[PDB]
Structure formats: structure tokens, C-alpha cells
Symmetry: C2
């Protein structure tokens, strides 16, 4: 019954893409009732492999995959897009250095932000997964004037799900009984998983775990989880990253559960005193494709201190791209 | 919610497993109201990687994943298993030849079949994905007397789905409009994709395509699809294989569509004159864990000749295994 929506995905030939595309085509991201047209962007160096992923998708015989198109042109991939998941970012090359990587991503997201503004749906919902996510998102939306800045987001949902997982393990309770988890700030080592408002079966998390565990075990473990997966598998956390991206878009479009909220890095509008413009993760609720930061939460010194640390790191990153004239 | 079911998956740290486990945990295989307990089996050399996969699974915060346990002991993995997906098989490297690969596979499935008969549920539903799928299935159930051999199957659903995809592409119709596709025999190059009873939007397939295309384009393309993926991606078709495994179990456990059927390699009972005992793919309908071969279909010379060729190959493979005392 529902008309198909177009889902653009970049870095479609990479690991995250490989774990992402099939679940999207299966209807797990926008609903089992929502047909999807996948428009995949891949570099010329990976277009061959991309065609390979296209065949595998066809080989799943997905009833909801109403369209499938791979391209090397951003203006084609983003044409009339309703959703855009920017997974592709600067590659990891031995020579590729910090500031150099910043120049590559500056070009990628400047070009993609412009393409989105030119050819995608004006209300296109964008999610940046490619790292550095928050800053890449900033470059993108700043270079997409004409488009609602709040339609540009970065992913901290994996950090958020990782936090929920650790809490459920410690309390010995089902992860489905964990609510109001929050990861503030940047998707980096400065991320701040907040347990002051989290609940386990309706009971405050800090009534089940002590501050010592929270500060010395919980936070660092959530922060190092990504490294943990790489050391164990010798490969990145593609499947769980794809899952978080799916949930990030899903909750944004379909809505968050009553009484709960999720983490989303979005352009700050001064909420909780956080500097404006930077893409900062906030606790958010969503309804009908629009989200709203959860305001009014009590913030103690412990939380404030870490919220500013991560905020400052984002300002530093923003300063650098600004100094390079990228925004 | 339904009572939790135990799903065992071997070769869980491999590529198919990486594209399979998350979707099962998401409820895509047995339904959104069916909690699942994942019991994963991995080799001693891949156990570290499996531990990493376990973490990624936890990091998805799946509400339906009621249990998760990794082990390198088959008797642990198959303990009270309701479903068993045997994906791990012999790794074909350099040097190791035919008879050699047959020995390792022989030890694998003789041990796993014995473990299943000893610790799994008596009505455990088994699906063999690891190649040679059909013959490994034979070895398994042969080494699991007592357990109903009909509960042991091999996967041809990927060939099946690939065939539906090719017919859909050729006819310019939605793949969801493709019904009654059949893949007969062995999961190998002698596989026979049957278009004589298939319909495209309710119309006989051969009324839309001719024998020349069917024989010279359709059959070869379906048979070579696996290689097509490898040349394009430089890696095997893991995501589509995982999807095929999910659908094989799903349609078997829940049920096939009204007026439609699917392909499953099952121990032969003389249907259509196929030799008894060999695991042979047949067009089948299924409901609540029980399948039935669709008998009475008209078989012309073209179909019969190809059905016999693949059946003879299966007989040979069976002979070789019997010669090694594996069965
Ligand atoms: N936002 C997140 O939580 C998150 C998690 C994992 C990977 N990533 C990033 O996503 C991008 C693609 O990763 P990939 O593994 O598919 O790389 P790949 O495309 O090289 O494989 C990278 O820039 C990576 O750093 C982001
Ligand atoms: N349709 C099928 O039955 C099918 C499809 C693909 C791969 N496979 C087999 O499944 C097994 C595991 O494959 P993998 O790529 O995950 O292996 P792996 O090397 O990653 O472990 C192999 O024996 C492979 O040949 C079977």
C-alpha cells in the first residue's frame, strides 16, 4: 500500500555496508510495510565489489526491495533521497595522516552535503556513521544550507547500545528492561555514558550499581568496547554498528517508546548549556520523523564535568575544520 | 511470548555466521514473538573471534535474545537444541585434496551427528549449510540413528532464491510475484532449477521466456552465481547464504505461502523415483516444523534427464562416503 522511499547509503561496499543493506532491504529499518529503493554510493575503486553486493541483495529475493541502483556519483545516489546514511569516509592509509584525513573528509562531506542540498528530498533524514562522525556531520550540514540542520545527525547509538548491554550484564537483568540510557557528546574516547537517569525495571540504575563501578569500570569499558571487538575479531564491529545505524534511523522515523528515550548526536541549540552548532549526542525522544532533546534533567557535577570535556573536544575539532576553511 | 527456543549454530565465527546470527537474534527466522537462545559452536582456532561476535551480539541489545553461549564443544552447543544450523565444514586450502577434504568433513559430521542424537531435543530440526551440503547431511543423520532422518536437511534455498531473482529480472516483474520455483537435487553444479511449474504473477513462466533462454542463460547463470559473487567481491556470498538459511528454517518452522512451495534437500523416500536415502532437493510445502514433498507434478524429458544426472552424482558421493566407512 505504501509508496516506496529512497534510501541512499554511501561506503556501501565496506564492512558496515555489508551488514547494513540486507537488514534494511528486509524492512528492519523503516517497517515491514515500507518498500525501499536502495541507492548505493561506492568509490570507483570499490564499484566492482559493490556490484557484487548488489547481486547478493537480489539473491535474497526481498519483497520490499522496490529498487536497487549502484553509482559513483553522489548526485545520483542522493537523488530524491528520503534517507541518507553516510557510512563512507576517508580511508585508513599508512601515508594518510591526521590533518590529511581531515582534508579528505572535508572534501567528502562538503561534496555530499552539497549534493544532498541539491538533489535529495528537502526533508531528507541524514545519519553520519563514517568517522569522525560528529565533525563529519558538521561539515556536511554546514555545506548544505537550504536544508534543515537538524536533519543531519551523527551516530552514538552503538555507544548507547553498548552502555545498555553492560548495565544489563552487571545487574543480571534483561537488556529489554533497561530504559533512559544516555551517552552525551562525541563518539570518541570522551563520550559520556550517563547512568544518573537510567532505569532497570523502573528502578534507578545507581541503586543497583555503586559509583565506584560506574566510574572505574562501566565508563572505560563502554569507551574501549570498540577496541575490544577489534582485538577479538581482528575486524571492526560492523554488524553491531549496522544495527545501531538501523535503530538510529528507525527510532527517528517510527518513534521512541513512551517513557523512554535514545541517544542521538545532533546540532546543538544550546540545550544544557552545550555550545551551539557542534553535533553533540543528547538524550532524545522522537515522533513522526522529528526528534526533540529531553530537557530538564538534573545534572550533577560528575555529569557536568564530563559533558563539558566532550563538548570541548568537539569545539576543538570544529575549530580545526573552521581553520581549514571547510565551514 | 512463546517459550524460548534453543538455536545452535556451528562455524559461528565465520562469514555466513556473521551475516546470520544478528538477524536470527532480531527475530527474523522464527518470528518477532519467539525469544531465542543462541548456542554457538566455533573451532578452538576461531574461539577468540567467536567471543568477539558474542560481544557484538550483546551490543545490539536484542530484546528476543534470551540466552547466548559460545563453546567449542558440540555436546554443549547442541544441548537441548530445538534447531541446529550446521554451517561449519572442512576448510578447503592448498594441498588438501578431494579424499582428504572428505575425511575431515567425515569427522566433522559424524561427531556432530552423534552429539545431536545424544544431547539435542529429539525433534531437533537440522539444516546443513556447509558444503558439500547434501552429503554432509547424509553423514550427519546416518550417524544419528534414533533421531528422525527427515529432521535432517541440506540447503538449496540459495539456489532457489537466485533462480527466482533471475526470473524476476528477466520478466521485469517483482520477485515477490515469483512462485512455485523449484531446485532439484544436489547443491552443486548439477543442480536443476525447474521453471516448468513456476508462475510469474500467476502466469506460467515458460509463457514469458523460451527454452533457449532457459537452458543457455537461466541454468548457467544460476549455477555460476556463486562464482560471480567471488569474482566481484573477492569473497563468497555470505549475506545471501545467511538469508537463505533464515528462510529455509522460517518456512519450515512457520509455514510456506498458500498455493506456493519452496526447495529443500531432504532424505529421499522414493518421491519421483529418486533413490532412497540420499539428501535430495525437492519442491516442498511446510507447516509447523513438518514438510511434505509436492508430488504429482508433471516431469517432462528435459526435467527428468537433469533430475537423474544430479541424483547419480549424489549416489556417487554417497558411494565414496560409504567406501570410507563414514556411513
Ligand atoms: N559511529 C560509530 O559508532 C561507528 C562504529 C564503527 C565504525 N564506524 C566508522 O564507520 C566507517 C566505516 O567502517 P567500516 O568498518 O565499514 O569500514 P570499511 O568500509 O573500510 O570496511 C569508518 O569511518 C568507521 O570508523 C563508526
Ligand atoms: N547455499 C549453500 O548451501 C552455501 C552457500 C554459501 C556458502 N556455503 C558453505 O557454507 C560453509 C561456510 O562458508 P563461510 O564462507 O562462512 O566460511 P568461513 O571460511 O568464513 O568459515 C562452506 O562450506 C561454504 O562452502 C553453502
Amino acid at each position: 500500500m505504501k509508496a516506496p522511499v529512497r534510501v541512499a547509503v554511501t561506503g556501501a561496499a565496506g564492512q558496515i555496508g555489508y551488514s547494513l543493506l540486507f537488514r534494511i532491504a528486509a524492512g528492519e529499518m523503516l517497517g515491514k510495510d515500507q518498500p525501499v529503493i536502495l541507492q548505493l554510493l561506492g568509490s570507483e575503486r570499490s564499484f566492482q565489489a559493490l556490484e557484487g553486493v548488489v547481486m547478493e541483495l537480489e539473491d535474497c529475493a526481498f519483497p520490499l526491495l522496490a529498487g536497487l541502483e549502484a553509482t559513483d556519483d553522489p548526485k545520483v545516489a542522493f537523488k530524491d533521497a528520503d534517507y541518507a546514511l553516510l557510512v563512507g569516509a576517508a580511508p585508513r592509509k599508512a601515508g594518510m595522516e591526521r590533518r590529511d584525513l581531515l582534508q579528505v573528509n572535508g572534501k567528502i562531506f562538503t561534496e555530499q552535503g552539497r549534493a544532498l542540498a541539491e538533489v535529495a528530498k528537502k526533508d531528507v533524514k541524514v545519519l553520519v556513521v563514517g568517522n569522525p562522525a560528529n565533525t563529519n556531520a558538521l561539515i556536511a550540514y554546514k555545506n548544505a544550507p537550504g536544508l534543515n540542520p537538524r536533519n543531519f545527525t551523527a551516530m552514538t547509538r552503538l555507544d548507547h547500545n553498548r552502555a545498555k548491554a553492560q548495565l544489563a550484564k552487571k545487574t543480571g537483568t534483561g537488556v529489554d528492561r533497561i530504559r533512559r540510557m544516555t551517552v552525551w557528546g562525541n563518539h570518541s574516547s570522551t563520550m559520556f555514558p550517563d547512568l544518573f537517569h537510567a532505569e532497570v525495571d523502573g528502578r534507578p540504575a545507581l541503586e543497583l550499581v555503586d559509583m565506584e563501578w560506574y566510574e572505574k569500570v562501566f565508563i572505560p569499558t563502554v569507551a574501549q568496547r570498540g577496541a575490544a571487538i577489534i582485538q577479538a575479531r581482528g575486524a571492526s564491529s560492523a554488524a553491531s554498528a549496522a544495527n545501531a545505524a538501523i535503530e538510529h534511523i528507525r527510532d527517528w522515523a517510527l518513534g521512541t517508546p513512551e517513557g523512554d528515550w535514545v541517544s542521538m548526536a545532533v546540532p546543538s541549540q544550546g540545550e544544557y548549556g552545550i555550545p551551539e552548532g557542534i553535533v553533540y549526542s543528547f538524550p532524545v525522544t522522537a515522533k513522526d520523523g522529528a526528534y526533540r532533546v529531553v530537557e530538564g534533567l538534573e545534572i550533577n557535577e560528575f555529569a557536568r564535568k564530563r559533558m563539558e570535556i566532550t563538548a570541548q573536544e568537539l569545539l576543538d575539532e570544529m575549530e580545526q575544520v573552521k581553520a581549514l576553511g571547510l565551514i
